Amino acid sequence: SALFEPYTLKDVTLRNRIAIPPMCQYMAEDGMINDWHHVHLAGLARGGAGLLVVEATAVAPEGRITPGCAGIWSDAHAQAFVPVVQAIKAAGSVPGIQIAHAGRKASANRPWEGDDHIAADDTRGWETIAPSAIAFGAHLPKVPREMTLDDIARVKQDFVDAARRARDAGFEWIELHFAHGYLGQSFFSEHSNKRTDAYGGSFDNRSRFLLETLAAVREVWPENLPLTARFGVLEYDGRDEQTLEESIELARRFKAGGLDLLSVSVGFTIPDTNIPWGPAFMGPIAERVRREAKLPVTSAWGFGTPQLAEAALQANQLDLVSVGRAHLADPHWAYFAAKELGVEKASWTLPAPYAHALE
Amino acid sequence: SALFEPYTLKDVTLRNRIAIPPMCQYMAEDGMINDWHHVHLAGLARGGAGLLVVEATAVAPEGRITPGCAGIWSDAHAQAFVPVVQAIKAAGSVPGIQIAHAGRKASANRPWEGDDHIAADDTRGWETIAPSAIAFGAHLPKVPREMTLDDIARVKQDFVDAARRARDAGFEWIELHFAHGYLGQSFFSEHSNKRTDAYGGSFDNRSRFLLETLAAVREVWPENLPLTARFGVLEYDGRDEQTLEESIELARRFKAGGLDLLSVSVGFTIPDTNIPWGPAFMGPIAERVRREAKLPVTSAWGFGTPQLAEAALQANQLDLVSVGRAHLADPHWAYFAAKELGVEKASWTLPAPYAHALE
Ligand SMILES: Cc1cc2nc3c(=O)[nH]c(=O)nc-3n(C[C@H](O)[C@H](O)[C@H](O)COP(=O)(O)O)c2cc1C
Ligand SMILES: Cc1cc2nc3c(=O)[nH]c(=O)nc-3n(C[C@H](O)[C@H](O)[C@H](O)COP(=O)(O)O)c2cc1C
């Protein structure tokens, strides 16, 4: 079975092609993770997946999506991750972390608490920042503050500081969050970036924030650990061919700049779009990025059906398959998949206290 | 749905009728539990089950089944349980613990390490104790040492000390392990008890160890928390009618002595038997105990099929349904069951970080 072949990138070897993508839990306090996270991530690692990527973790307080997002903007935040990282490794999974800045989508409620921008006079909120003073709209109406050149320097450094802490906390895999309408995605897109300086206008200028952040992170992140990013390569906004072309060009530059793998997504930069949701609908897009940028990719959305994950791999649309929600429903999804695909001794996808009992 | 109605016993209210029965993990060192246990049990509680009973935990070093069994034979062992108990409560589940002494079945290997009595010159082994110097046979050939009256006093006190620690560590539910061929079961059965003193021979004498242990535990265990036990009511050894009669009589005495619920099992006292394994095969037996001793019961074996658990309840064969292995395969089995039985907003069987995403 292809889903259960190992995968080697730099010095890191995943035991199978199952990746658990970053999924926010909204359970942190002041950026600090706790026993929710520890048990959640520990449980997931024991489930069998080859790689577990920790949720979007803010490089700065204002870059949190919500008041419950994790953070890594201080050495104390980083140190909180240490036991969890060690528990993930103990379970045989590779610990990864996505580091992030939510840009104009920041200062919002938890999804079960309105999922919308925090009210003006709610003491939990904060001013958001972005390339340009334009609001997302819809449920996120707040107009962000336009970043100064010093803001841009500071955020870039926040990312470096974040990667450095991530490295020292023991993570073996890092993912830069340049997707889903957040800060990085918003610099690339013309919908959200109307800057007239070095960081807006042309393709080279809109790319600049993302490329510089990568290069600066590369300086602290170990050469021998996969350096990756997530990136919305299209919007389904009626400009897909041209957006894809530019996104693929940028992916080529990422690769040239040391990016080992690209997590391929949709931009979600603006609300007025028409996304053709469906099981593995991202496969064909992911496959085009892989071919044309000649770069390993993962993607997600509906791969919780084990045969679908298997086909994506055999067709070389993906190098790893990211399975999100199915892992929230069943932390042992990898075991479910092994059984479904007929893996020999499938119960030994799990640790011995479970495996012996289930064979 | 009956499986998802709450259940009140003394001052304790379970949020549904799903019980996770004690399942040994064999991951403790010198009786001390660790992060395996913490994450395992924490994960299970968040899964949705109303009650989570911690694995057979030894009241004395020699009463462990294996070198990896948990123990509660010192205040330090008990204190190790404290964080786990608090994590279980935080998740909305009721923390229970089964306290145990493996009798002649003690000093054995982990199931994936031979599952058999430890070799003579293996430094991990120890002498076993029992009512009479007779070996189980088969894979457990060691002849136990015949207990003195002082051994019996000491073990009884170990059980009291165990319940006391369990109480102080915060458990809200206790289960005495008088089943599966272990010490308690071995005092009741004529196959294993050939004593000619006050603790062997007649029904009153064979019952004595179990009844005294209960009464002594009752002295320290809070009146307002369910006091329960697990008990093999038959052997499938060709003596089932008479064994059942005596077992039911004992259950009546348990009830008269303060037992709030009885976990009904098979004795497993000897190997030469013919167990009619099948989905919910214990239902009819459990139901007879319930009727004739007029005592709430749970049982297990194959109730991981949600409709089977539901039927058992509607037919009043059981008051709680114990689901073991299915929870090792999927810690979120209760959520699986809610969906299968059509529970309204089934995803909210899980905590918000999962539930909101899965609705
Ligand atoms: C609760 C929830 C939280 C998520 N948090 C993040 C995140 O922090 N960063 C990110 O890139 N994607 C995040 N995602 C997107 C997922 O990584 C994944 O792409 C998505 O769930 C689709 O894959 P699936 O069908 O397997 O669920 C999140 C998704 C969900 C449902
Ligand atoms: C690994 C494993 C460990 C178990 N440990 C214990 C135990 O410590 N005490 C006990 O009474 N039963 C123990 N049991 C028996 C279970 O509680 C339960 O009765 C059994 O698994 C059958 O139910 P099920 O079909 O839902 O698995 C254990 C069972 C298994 C598979």
Tell me the three-class secondary structure of B293-346, residue by residue.
HCCCEEEECCCCCHHHHHHHHHCCCCCEEECCHHHHHCCCHHHHHHHHCCCCCH
Q: How many CA atoms lie within 13 A of B175 on its CB side?
A: 28
Give chain A positions within 8 Å (CB) of B46: 39
Distance CA A330, CA A336 (A): 9
Q: Round to whole Å and give the CA distance between A322 and A302.
A: 9
For residue B353, how far is its CA from the centre of ligand 2 (angstroms)?
30
First-last CA distance in chain B: 19
Q: Which amino acid is at B215?
A: A
Sign of the dihedral defined by the CA atoms of residues B342, B343, B344, B349, in that order: negative
> How open is the CA angle A228-A59-A103, to the nearest 5 degrees?
90
Give the C-alpha separation, B104 to A78, whole Å: 50
Measured distance CA(A217)–CA(A210) in Å, rounded: 11
Tokens representing residue A200 in the block: 């807006």
Cα-based angle A53, A160, A22 (whole degrees, multiple of 5): 15
Resolution in A: 1.9
What radius of gyration do chain B's Cα atoms show?
Answer: 19
CA–CA separation, A147 vs A151, rounded Å? 5
Residue A236, amino acid: Y
Segment (H or E) for B169:
helix B149-169
In the block, tokens 């899964």 appear at: B47
Name the DSSP letter for residue B186: H
Contacts of B324 (CB under 8 A, 6+ apart): B20, B21, B23, B300, B304
| Binding site membership of B300 for ligand 2 (Cβ less than 6 Å) | yes
Q: Is B182 a catalytic residue?
A: yes
Type of residue at A302: G
The residues, ordered by sequence, that sit 6+ positions from B291 with a Cβ below 8 Å of its Cβ are: none
CA–CA separation, A352 and B110 (whole Å):
10
Reduced DSSP (H G I as helix, E B as strand, rest coil) percent helix, strand, coil of chain A, to 5 = 40, 15, 45
Q: Which of A291, A295, A296, A323 is nearest to A309 (CA)?
A: A323
Q: What tokens appear for A211 in the block?
A: 């490329």
Chain A interface residues (partner B, CB cutoff 8 A): 23, 25-27, 35-36, 38-40, 42-43, 46, 87, 90, 110-112, 325, 328-332, 335-336, 350, 352-358
Which three-class secondary structure state does DSSP give residue B138?
Answer: coil
The residues pairing with B177 across neighbouring beta strands, listed in sequence order, are: B230
- Is ligand 2 within 6 A of the CB of residue B93? no
**Is the Cβ–Cβ distance between A293 and A279 less than 8 Å?**
no
Range list of H helices, chain A: 35-46, 75-90, 149-169, 183-188, 203-218, 240-256, 283-293, 306-314, 325-329, 333-340, 352-358
Residue B292: count other Cβ atoms within 10 Å of its Cβ: 15
DSSP-derived 3-state class of residue B72: coil
* Structure tokens given for B243: 């064994």
Residues in chain B: 359
How many C-beta atoms lie closer than 10 Å to residue A141's C-beta? 10
Strand-pairing partners, residue B8, are B13
Exposure b/e, A96-114, CB count within 10 A at least 16 = b = bbbbbbbbbbbbbbbbeee
Experimental technique behind these coordinates: X-ray
Whether the CB-CB separation of A170 and A89 falls below 8 Å is answered with: yes
Residue with tokens 């007649």: B202
| DSSP β-bridge partners for residue B99 | B57, B176
Q: Which residue, among B1, B3, B169, B7, has the nearest Cα to B88 in the 3D structure?
A: B169
Helix/strand/coil for B159: helix
Q: How far is CA B120 from CA A210, B123, B134, B303, B342, in A?
A: 66, 8, 17, 39, 55
Give the chain A residue nearest B349 (alpha carbons). Answer: A329
Mode of pairing for the β-strands spanning A7-9 and A12-14? antiparallel
Sign of the Cα torsion A98, A103, A104, A109 reads positive
What is the whole-number distance in angstroms between the Cα of residue B7 and the centre of ligand 1? Answer: 36
Rounded to whole angstroms, the Cα distance separating A272 from A239 reads: 12
- B135, B144 Cβ separation under 8 angstroms: yes
Rounded distance between C-alpha atoms, residue A60 and residue A152, angstroms: 12
**What CA–CA distance (Å, rounded) separates A144 from A135?**
6
Nearest to A100 by CA among A22, A196, A28: A22
Q: Are A261 and A17 in contact (CB under 8 A)?
A: no
- Phi, psi dihedrals of residue B103, rounded to the nearest 5°: 55, -130
For residues A234 and A268, the answer to whether their CB atoms sit within 8 Å is: no
Concatenating the DSSP letter of every residue in B233-297 gives EE-SSS-HHHHHHHHHHHHHHHHHTT--EEEEEE---SSS------TTTTHHHHHHHHHHHT--E
Q: Distance between CA atoms of B119 and B116, rounded to whole angstroms?
A: 9
Measured CA to CA, the distance from residue A224 to residue A10 in angstroms comes to 5
Give the bridge partners for A145, in sequence order: A129
Q: Parallel, antiparallel, or unpaired for β A261-266 and A297-300? A: parallel
Single-letter code of the amino acid located at A143 = V
Which chain A residues are Cβ-neighbours of B27 within 8 angstroms?
353
Q: How far is CA B72 from CA A84, A330, B108, B216, in A?
A: 27, 31, 19, 17
Distance A336 CA to ligand 1 centre (A): 20
In chain A the domains, ranked by start, together with CATH numbers, are 1-359 (3.20.20.70)
Distance between CA atoms of residues A215 and A208, nearest Å? 10
Separation in Å, CA A183 to CA A135, A211, A242, B69, B158? 12, 13, 21, 51, 61
CB atoms closer than 10 angstroms to residue B82: 12
Those residues with Cβ within 8 angstroms of residue A241's Cβ, 6 or more apart along the chain or in another chain: none
Find all residues with CB under 8 Å of B295, minimum gap 6, and list them: B251, B252, B254, B255, B259, B261, B262, B289
Identify residues of B whose CB sits under 8 angstroms from chain A CBs: 23, 25-27, 35-36, 38-40, 42-43, 46, 87, 90, 110-112, 325, 328-332, 335-336, 350, 352-358
Which residues on B lie below 8 Å from A327 (Cβ)? Answer: none
Does B323 contact ligand 2 (Cβ within 6 A)? yes
**Sole residue written with tokens 């359970």:** A27
Atom of ligand 1 nearest to the CA of A177: 11
**Nearest-angstrom CA–CA distance, B2 and B189:** 36
Q: If residue A350 lies in a helix (H) or strand (E), which one and from where to where?
A: none
Pocket test for ligand 1, best of A3, A23, A177 (most atoms within 8 A of CB): A23
Task: State the Cα–Cα distance between residues B6 and B24, nearest whole angstrom.
Answer: 27
Side-chain-facing half-sphere of B57: CA atoms under 13 Å:
32
